[PDB]
Every structure is written in C-alpha cells, then in structure tokens.
C-alpha cells in the first residue's frame, strides 16, 4: 500500500 | 519518476507560488475563495500523514513540507493578515456538501479499511472538487483577474499531466490506482469550461466572462 506520488 | 509527473509537480508548485506572491505583493486577497484554500490545506494535511511512516525520497519529503507550508501560509493571508480584503459575501459555496459526502465515500470506497488509508482516500476525493468554491465565486462575481486565471491554468494542468503520468506508469511499470485515476479524471473534467475560456479569451488578450 505504498503511496509514492504527491 | 517520469517527465509528465515532474512537470505536473512543477506546474502545481507554480500555481501555489503564483497565488501566494499575488496576495503577498498586492496586500489583498480580493477575488480569491478562502474556502478553496481551506479545502486544499485539508488535502495536504490528510494526504501527507505518511511523512511519519514512510520515506520515498528527499524530493518527495521536501515537496510535501513545501505544499503544507505554502497552503497554511495562503490560508493565514486570507483569513488573518489581509482579512479586510476577503470577499466573504461572494465566497458563499456551502462546503459541507463536499466534506460530509466525500468523508462518507472515503470510508466506504477505499483500498484498505484503516485510519491512514481512509484519510489518504478522503484527500484524493476532496481534491477532485476543492476548486469548486473558487469557480463558483468567479461565476457569481462575473469576471476573474488575469493573475487568478494563470493560477487556475497551472493548477488545472497539474492533474491533467498526472493522467499522462498514470498512462506511462501503467505501460512501463504495470502500476495502476483506480481511485487516483477516477478522481483525477473528475478533477480535470471540472476545468473544461475554464480551459476553453482561458484559450479563447485570456490567451487572446480578452477578459474572462
Ligand atoms: C512533458 C510535459 C508537457 C508540458 C507541456 C506544457 C508546459 C507549458 C510550457 C511550454 C509548452 C508551450 C506552450 C504551448 C502549448 C501547446 C499550444 C498548442 O497546442 O498550439 C499553439 C498554436 O495553436 C500553434 O499554432
Ligand atoms: C525548459 C522548460 C522545461 C519544463 C519541464 C521541466 C522538466 C525538467 C527540466 C528539464 C528537462 C531535462 C531534465 C533531464 C536532464 C538530464 C539529466 C540526466 O541525465 O538524468 C539521468 C537520469 O538518471 C535519467 O533517469
Ligand atoms: C528549477 C527547476 C525548474 C522548475 C520550473 C521552472 C519554472 C520557472 C521558470 C521560469 C519563470 C518564467 C515564467 C513565469 C512564471 C510562470 C507563470 C507565468 O507565466 O505567469 C504567472 C506570473 O506570476 C505573472 O503572470
Ligand atoms: C454538490 C456536490 C455533490 C457531492 C460531491 C461528491 C464528490 C465526489 C467526487 C469524486 C469521487 C470520485 C471517485 C469515485 C469512486 C471511484 C473509486 C473506485 O472505483 O474504487 C474501487 C476500489 O478499489 C474498490 O474498493
Ligand atoms: C461533481 C463531479 C462531476 C464530474 C462528473 C464527470 C466525470 C466522471 C469521471 C469518471 C467516471 C468514472 C466512472 C467509473 C467509476 C467506477 C466506480 C465503481 O463502480 O467502483 C467499484 C466499487 O468501488 C467496488 O466497491
């Protein structure tokens, strides 16, 4: 569930 | 990381600095919806709580801190420092029709039923409609100042570039997020009339509406 964007 | 999302991020930071410098130098927040800025501050606040659980990169951490700081500073200029020029009588969008349903939908439709994921989802749905009070104020007052239209152009272009970024990431790294995509399409769709008017009038030296 990694959120890598702004 | 690709050029579409990098330009999208740079276009978003440009919009935030255009607005912050406009209010600061002119000493006035006339024509600006304070309600939209409260919603954009709420977006960064609920989205970037992961700053305490995750490290993606120095750029990702810096951009998060910059967005939070500029968003809180813009709310401070409108509601405290230059409150004498805040047009409360024309910024009348009832924001509870956005917050309460968006809160309900983030609890029901999410990737995981956990506090941090629900709060992230709420930031994604809230950002789709966050500009609605500003577009509503412009329709009510009639026109929009040239600098305000430039702010709206760079803010609208930012999530449109994120749609291109998502096509790229789907093709090259098999990554796909339906919640961000659907909400990003809704977000961009709401700029359709503004973009048509910005290209046909503003970019031809004519005034909006
Ligand atoms: C990969 C990231 C893409 C970011 C791209 C936007 C960034 C804005 C800056 C420069 C583009 C130049 C501005 C012109 C944009 C296209 C205008 C156009 O389509 O046509 C102009 C005219 O009609 C022809 O005669
Ligand atoms: C001029 C208006 C530009 C508006 C859009 C801003 C986008 C970023 C800026 C410049 C593009 C060139 C940046 C790349 C320069 C080369 C860097 C390099 O070699 O990077 C290697 C890296 O590992 C590869 O993945
Ligand atoms: C550092 C890595 C690249 C970061 C991205 C580089 C963007 C800034 C470049 C040029 C500024 C010149 C263009 C003027 C600023 C753009 C907004 C604009 O055209 O007008 C709004 C302005 O406040 C009055 O209208
Ligand atoms: C007057 C105002 C009326 C009220 C305004 C409400 C604003 C709602 C906005 C955007 C929601 C867009 C996203 C719609 C949901 C798509 C998400 C989805 O399909 O998620 C699949 C998930 O993986 C399954 O768990
Ligand atoms: C106020 C905003 C008005 C803007 C309106 C125009 C923009 C509509 C854009 C996309 C439609 C997306 C339709 C597809 C969404 C699918 C949602 C769905 O069925 O998701 C499965 C569910 O979440 C399992 O739990």
Numbering used by the authors:
A (entry chain B): 3 to 8
B (entry chain A): 1 to 209
Question: What text appears in the publication on this structure?
Answer:
The selective capture and retrieval of ER luminal proteins is controlled by the KDEL receptor (KDELR), which recognizes a specific ER-retrieval signal sequence (ERS) Lys-Asp-Glu-Leu (KDEL) at the C terminus of cargo proteins. Crystal structures of the chicken KDELR revealed a seven transmembrane (TM) spanning integral membrane protein with structural homology to the PQ-loop superfamily of membrane transporters. In the mildly acidic environment of the Golgi, KDEL-containing ER luminal proteins bind the receptor with high affinity, which elicits a signal for the integration of receptor-cargo complexes into COPI vesicles. In contrast, the neutral pH of the ER results in cargo release and the subsequent relocation of the empty receptor back to the Golgi, resetting the retrieval cycle.
We first sought to obtain structural insights into the transient ER form of the KDELR-cargo complex, which exists following delivery from the acidic environment of the Golgi. To capture a ligand-bound structure of the chicken KDELR at neutral pH, we took advantage of the higher affinity observed for the TAEHDEL peptide compared to the TAEKDEL variant, KD 0.24 μM vs. KD 1.94 μM, respectively. Crystals of the KDELR bound to the TAEHDEL peptide were grown at pH 7.0 using the lipidic cubic phase method and diffracted X-rays to 2.6Å. The receptor adopts the active state, with TM7 kinked out exposing the di-lysine COPI retrieval signal. Previous structural studies on the KDELR bound to either TAEKDEL or TAEHDEL peptides revealed two ordered water molecules (W1 and W2) at the base of the binding cavity. However, in the structure determined at pH 7.0, only one of the two water molecules (W2) is visible in the electron density maps. For structures at acidic pH, the water molecule at pH 7.0 coordinates interactions between His12, Tyr67 and Tyr162 on TM2 and TM6, respectively, and Asp9 on TM1 and does not interact with the carboxy-terminus of the TAEHDEL peptide. The loss of the W1 water molecule in the pH 7.0 structure thus collapses the hydrogen bond interaction network observed under acidic conditions, with the carboxy-terminus of the TAEHDEL peptide now only interacting with Arg47 and Arg159. At neutral pH, where only one water was resolved and the His12 has zero overall charge, there are two possible locations for the proton – either on the Nδ (HID) or on the Nϵ nitrogen (HIE). Therefore, HIE is the most likely state at pH 7.
